[model samples]
Target: HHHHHMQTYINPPLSEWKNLIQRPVQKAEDLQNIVLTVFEDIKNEKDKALINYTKKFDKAYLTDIRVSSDEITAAIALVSDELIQAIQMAASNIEKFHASQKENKNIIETTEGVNCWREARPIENIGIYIPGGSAPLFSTVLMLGIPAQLAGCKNITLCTPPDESGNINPAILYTANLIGIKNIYKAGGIQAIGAMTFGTETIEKADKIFGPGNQYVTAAKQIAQNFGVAIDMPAGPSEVLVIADTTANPEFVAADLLSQAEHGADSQVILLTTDENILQQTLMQVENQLTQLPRKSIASQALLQSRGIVLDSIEKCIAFSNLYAPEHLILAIENTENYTDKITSAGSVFLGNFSCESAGDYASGTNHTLPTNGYARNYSGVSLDSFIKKITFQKVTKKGIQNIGPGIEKMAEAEELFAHKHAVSVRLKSLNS
Candidate 1:
């Protein structure tokens, strides 16, 4: 089914009585087969195959998969001071936001003596990929690293593509250092994921993995999940959708569209406006703004793949935005708060004209890692909570055992499980004695 399929917005249906909704449905071809396949050669002999692919894809020798420390030090030194500071700033903000998502559960007494509690613990070992193909994602380090740090996860490993020099990006290394991650692997593309999932000679198998990448990376994530390795989600390319009204500023809306567009060629961005004038102005703004962007070519490709839907009423736009369940949803309407309730399935929401998504992407104290494509309907963005496992706990006291044991025994007996019935009956009889 197409996303925003048959989605519509209204024009003047309020007091004057008019059909104000118009949903401009988009044509979504299946995203599969859109990119080059990275893992064509594979067999039970994955080790030699991975090493061979490593040389072919990463352009580096794979005598060892681990990046040398001297290389990491040089990378950190070669990277600029300004960029390091910027990454740190983004990390702090991302940390602050994800830190809030940390859920610490407590014990609750379901009955007078029956106690139930929940507790959270970090998954002991996990791997993170900081995407580095078109652009090195230092922001992802902030999104993934800070939370893992907060959760005190040990044995955290990272894998990122190296440069033409077979060296890791300085900014990425610096951020990894700042996050206290030393298990940095130079291997990248699908090979890195294969190593993390199946365990190479140099790497260990991870219980879970995190990060966003191109189609190759996403496909590998899926393959890993199919093979029983835990993955965060089956993600698609990053994308964003914005709903704008007459009150919304065209510049902010255009800039918001450009931000996600610059992510990659396949990344999609959508703009919906109730005002025809806003739509026209944004088109002009997008064109004008493209000239100044360094990633103009990439953004242009994405812009071609994206569209602007026209809506007549802000209320209808909000309703449809909720229906599409965009990865990132921006409400550029009058009453942002009133419409927020309608947003039931967005990875994240940016409210009002001041809440541009770029702020969250960079330094707005929120996680830039988010559910992409239409997965926002079911999955959530990366958070500290994503790195930790929440475990529930419960214990029954003598009075609780006496209170609820008979019911359990009776139910167990009713099911004709004599062993199950005796397990509870034995405890009850002891308590009575």
Candidate 2:
């Protein structure tokens, strides 16, 4: 018996779509207990817990957790000039895209003599966690660090798991150094999140923590919020949904799906097509292409949970996609301009055959740290706004208060709040006098 690559559904009932679109289930109790224990240990033991966990989890014994200037210099020297140039190019694009998100101060007069405005201030202290394992994810440094820099965030602390050799990935270090992040630490997983949540001797307590990580790190980030530390957003396994028609290139659609599927075994990819021939062709291309990928087994496992659906029309496909609210939505259909506006929910959208999701993940300058597992319904992908807080200001002149104060007094009196009425009454009387 052979395993089918992806399950197929032909116009499944709308009632069943919810269960069909469900993500892989995660056991909450198991993850929460571990995250809580780690948080408590870090709170009680501080840096000692970090060192012990680094050894236990990362299998790296370190004399010091903080990365030194000399280490950064060595790492920079180790990075290839080609890779350096690529990072610089990506960084430049990222900086430009994020810089454009800056809002100009616009003072709006709601009423004569009443002026209100809003301004963005960078979050002073920020912590960024870069996952280190088979993939260094140095690009994430650009996704997060560049915006932090563009937003003028001060005191950036970076943490990543060190190898058993007790060294950080050269690319991670090089990227961080390139982006002007000075505080680097050799910590990972729950311990790194814990260290940032509660300031250790080596790591600084951050007002907000940002990055994508495995399930353990995700749970740890959720726990950090209870301790008064903010997180970027709740994250889950990466996913992409491609809505392809006969006009879309099956090869490009399959390649996009595989790119996300290779993220992890837990990751999922869905293919929705109005044409059954397109659906079959894309699945065939997926299998043919999977053989070439080194992470074939991981992608194969992900495909076990994936689906290819043949909907009645492109409109139905779009409706189903909105229901899924995927992290990455690829409109591989033709004339994407006609359908793009109908897409109401998605973390990031890729239009047409040429717009590959990898471009955004790597060099296209959009933040890849996005909402997943239906979170796109509400949360947005990380952007320049993620690194700043918007503070609103308003000024009311005597004339302004006089115009609005009587209404305030009347409303407050109707509610039987004399103190509120008195405060406005006093002001109104003074203005009249």
Candidate 3:
């Protein structure tokens, strides 16, 4: 097999930066057609379509789609004690991080006796999809479920594809159960998303759906919005951009880049360095380490589209990274804090050499469910805020209305809103009398 090498650009001009920041595009039309067909089937047939799709796609025949108490008990036993402890530790950290996001209702007095404040309420009935295949993604359960649990969402449903034997992954079950997710379903791909969107016989129709999946799942989530079901955010292939300098460790930089690359063939990893020596050494390290990975073929495909750019300085590197707006941005350079404020976009930021992207992915008390494909410019990663909606509350007393009523009436009349003017005038007249 040929060796994988990252495409390099040496101080490409500002005009060329736009083209370099583009992500590999997928055939959206084909994906949309397939997703729409499955959505239609599920909307009409419900459970029957869900079952057939599970069998067809996952190759697993299912008598029942809902995971039973017996299955949970069996699955829990299958998980090793060591893994359970590790999961518990990660859960604790995740819970602590999310719990801190809770806001105290701060009522503000805009005018005498006029009070306004906002309170957070959990979104009721949320469905979380866990991708099933080579990677079960139990950690995602902690990232999403802990927030849902902390937000106090009324009903939480978990779904994953069953294996050939019609069984869910033991670790997935163990993690879901650990987080108090009682409703686990055996479903996958567009069908799983469809069940959540339309509500199958067993699965609950969710107000919002959450989780990461293949292109099919991403398309299904986007389509779910048409049916009034909310999704966490627009998702794409995972990506990471590292800005390293002379002080950065080449081995560490290479490892961080490959960690993102191994996520999928579509995943992209970029390395930006001010020093040519550091850039060349990091690429060599990436080549040396690539052969050792079990997912080498997948990572190699990702590397084909990835880039290693030698910039003139760290400032220019940060400027390029902001334009890319990667899902994960690592500052492998010294004095990372100095550059952090200049970074205006990125789903998540990692500071310094020790802060590996995997830490945030697994146990660094940060949500790993992040926006990709340059959506970071406008979107944020999933957090405690994602699970809840904020409702603003305002109270105006008799005196408060009397104080501001004339101004309100004048503004309303100026805007040609006679009803609005009348409403305020009527209240003001009553208060004055």
Candidate 4:
């Protein structure tokens, strides 16, 4: 239950190993109470509430909630040409990858003329919150924006915290512009979510919201859904479970672990390996790699909650990973292709030594906005599917009605719903008559 430092476990049983993988969910006791008060204020005061919260949280007293066209143009100019070029390349690949997730659904005649099919419809107005806490998540703009665009989402309203000078990150601004999203808001934390949920004079309410953030942000999304706004998923802090072997590069493995750790103090990283040597070497490698990181203190704090576990075999390592259900899973074994199917639950997976988790986070063409904590047990990473809703359609002909009517009537009759049975009987009579 308590980890004084980056702990290690050696060939422990399932009961003991379970303790090593336990992640502390990023839910502050007061987070629920605080967002509730904010949501209520947002409901009543509208844009005024947003402005007030912005001043308190971001320390910027902003008259304008909306980022102006002038600011966007200036942001474009400030961003380097090389970075812009890189964003374009990443956007292209992200577009292609998400576009490929589009469903090629076909109408099926289930019982001769009872045609049924499903079509995807965009949510129209979407809100995206890019976390500007520890880092400027420009990559998130690509991950969420590209999918929204590809899915035909009509409008995307993005928000990130601006500095005390009321200036948003140039890279964040540039990325949004590159994706063709113009309605950017200089807001963050609870207030940004509040503005999105209740709809201010400047920022319109969203049909659904998407993105990753801290505890308050995640909790706000949950509350937003209750007020008729759909969310991408029940998200939490970022995490990863790497299943490496003797074959995995200790340096590469260490780097991958630190990548998520640097995100926040709440983020977690775990290593499950069959080889003790791999375990020991990776821990040392991680400590060595940790020092060179610019966010060394944050990563160090996160590593306090993380652990390296030694399993009996690769199979056992995988079994434990399934139970933990990480946001990201890395298979750094010899023949990575062989064990991919064994992975049943994870937000996203990276195979082999070269396929580092960072590639997927930035530009490997996969959405990095994944379900965190243990939500990977049921939920999935953001994709084109996240931006759209699947509406199913069925057209029943007279013959089709006749085909299914008897069974329906019998079921309804058995359930003692006379009206339900009678409705079908009347329909059948009209057809016969």
Candidate 5:
């Protein structure tokens, strides 16, 4: 009896509908048992563990983990001129962007006799994962590979899943060769992660792992870290939160949202717009533009699993955005700088209409290996800084000891650690004498 316009819009606040969706949702985290189960399987079966899981998950039959140089060379052969040019351009821009992260050695003589300093060192071996489920992200290879090489990492091993043909997409290989990486594995999903984590007969135990993956892929990476191998971050599903006003172009807004949605069925795109008119217009735009996309089905599926909630004010919009801590945050508004300080967390920020998130992902000279699954609340996107370790150093002289030693001794003695107290007291005694 109350039926009206089928697609009529309703303006509602988060609080009003909060109760409709609330009551302790399932905790958004990987269960420990799932990881332990994989680890146990790997330990017992060794390299065979990966082969079995690959078939089970990716539905491809494969045995080896390392993808060979010849396979890479052959794949390099298939690179179309246009695509090769595009990837090469992306590599150069990415290099230009990440090169700034290099750390300079610092030596400081805090005192006349004591010296302290810091130097940066690369981790040496880095394991990078490239998603091959829906599509092979050759771009990610450049994102992770370029930085690792620049950081002085020697051995860069890449892993991507095989398609029905039981081999990684040839384009992925072309990108790998272009980046000066050779060690590759024909593994996907948890199998690839397990091979790298535990290191079967073929795969070596990596110092750290990097790159994006699906949910099961993410679960495997997190499990790898627990088993003593380091990972770049707790990377999960891709997410973007766009904060816009009426000034935003509904068409562009819809396009940006759909760009992220197409990443995966689990990925989420949120729009924080104060103007109901713009929100409704953008929703319509999404419907219109999505129909034309090659990835329309995937994008539309993701949109349903995600949201496009309208807010009453930019302040409220920002508050929720901060909580979400999205992997990508787009401010399609006027005077982006004014609202930037309000942003407490995000993996990356795109300012103005001209600054598209895709630019950051592909080119525009910014690293694309970003934190996802709300990890942006604490973690940062991958950069040159992620590749190197910074060791801090310091020094002191007699006068310097005199100035700071008493404080150390008083505290050390009061804490009842005479060894720590005398360590300073002994030096001071000799200096005083």
Candidate 6:
């Protein structure tokens, strides 16, 4: 294999491969301080800082931060009908999947008269940050917007960096409109995140933010979360770990790995297989396919940091996969159902040989906004639940109060919280009277 592409490993000791399995360590400390400065300027100066950052980063000096209705309408015309249809189709699937996730809880009587339940309520204000530059993420609009709409979010703000012409991508605009979100902002990076965390003159503050971006953007998200704004999760570099066997097609495996690697130079792809032949073949296939792409340099850079491991068994492959907790996992082997139950952690899984990770990235029903960089161990991907908060409700009847009142009084008194006991005592007294 060429030195530019990833290297294949034999069944090595776990200690030697420990560092290899871990996600590329990002130098976030330097970026964190820079994002903090951006956050501070935006928090204090608001629109003035937003405009300055736009000029510095996006090379667009925007007078109006909000995307006007005229521009949105014009953008629809600019997009091709075929692409629009595709976006619509993707949106339909995403909408259907997320809509089905809508929870209707039944009020359950805990005791004879005490009832409790939880209801999902939409967040009033939400901000979605789409990475915009050479590649505008219109698919991300469907991933985030459709769910927010289904969850009945009142205010949805969308933000993306503008081109040199100070205009947003027409596809992005069209997709946002199709998803029923209109408040689009012309800001990106740390400034955009800060603008949403604390409202600017033209933009409104969001209760939560969503999307994926570079390390700087990820750092900004962490800062936003610290400042009381909820984020989808601690998303980082795009990554995929594929577990293949003798039955796996190497071309498909290589294609899946390269798909993520092409996302950026920071993206990582790993191949773990029980068959050494599959490992060697996939590495060669990745090199062969890497040259055909326009983003060969970027993908090559990513591959330089990636590796291929030869595990002893499928169980070991899954065990290592769980330890890595990759953003995307592809099972390109025979009888995928047999091993699915073994999977403990992953943002999303693609079963069998034909299931490509790109399906979930775009057209598939599953939301592509998922936890990355080992966060999948705890955090879940964005869904209808991510856009809504569950408020639990409980009611106590007079008989219910009579049944639990003595216990509550005793517990409160034990804790020396007289007010708590008095509150229950007063309710009990009223019930008695």
Q: What order do you get sorting by lDDT, best first?
A: 3, 2, 6, 4, 5, 1
RMSD, one per candidate, in order: 5.3, 1.5, 1.4, 2.4, 3.5, 1.7
- lDDT tens string, model 2, 210-310? 99888788889998999999999998889999998888999999999999999889999999999889988888898899999999999999998999999
Evaluate all candidate structures by whole-model CA lDDT and list the values in order.
Answer: 0.75, 0.92, 0.92, 0.87, 0.79, 0.90
Model 3, span 1-433: residue lDDT tens: 8454898989899999989998987765667788889999998999999999989989988999999999999999999999999999899999999999999989999999799999999999999999988577899989999999999999999999999999988999999999999999999999999999999878879999999888789889998899999999987889999999999999999999999999899999999999789988999999999989999999999999899999999999999999999899999988887888999999999999999999999998999999999899898899989999999999999988988888999999899999999999889778678
**Best of the candidates, TM-score:** 3
Q: What is the TM-score of each candidate against the true structure?
A: 0.87, 0.97, 0.97, 0.95, 0.88, 0.95
Give the per-residue lDDT of model 5 (tens digit) for 1-433.
5211112224565666543222113237755677678778877897788888777877777756678777877887877999988998999999998897776676777655567888888987789888785466788888899999999998888888887778778888898888898888888777677777877777777888888776677788877776788888886668788888988999999889889988766677777788778877888888888878898777766776566667777887788787777889999998888889999989999998878889999989888888877788788888988887777767687788888898899899889999999899988999788
Better of 1 and 5 by lDDT: 5
Q: What is the lDDT of residue 172 in candidate 5?
A: 85
Runs of candidate 6 with Cα error greater than 4 angstroms are 1-4
Model 1 agreement with the true structure over 1-433: per-residue lDDT tens digits:
4222112232433442222222223345443342223333333445676667767877766565577788678878877888878877777777777778776566788987898976779988888987776456677777788888888788889988766566677778888888888888877777778778777666777889988776677777877786667887766767788988889899888888888888777777767788778887887788788889999888887776676767677776666666666788888888787777767888888889999888887788777777765677788787777778778788888899888888988899889999998888888888778
The residue pairs that clash in candidate 4, if any, are: none
Query: Which residue pairs in model 5 clash with each other?
Result: 65-185, 67-184, 111-397, 114-395, 114-396, 115-394, 115-395, 116-393, 116-394, 117-393
Per-residue lDDT of model 4, residues 289-389, tens digit only = 88799999999889888888889788898889998899999999899777888888898999999999888988889988888778888898888888888
Of the pair 2 and 5, which is ahead by TM-score? 2
Q: 2 or 4, which is superior by lDDT?
A: 2
Of 3 and 6, which scores higher on lDDT?
Answer: 3
**In angstroms, how far off is 102's CA in candidate 6?**
0.6
Model 5 segments more than 4 A misplaced = 1-34, 51-64, 106-116
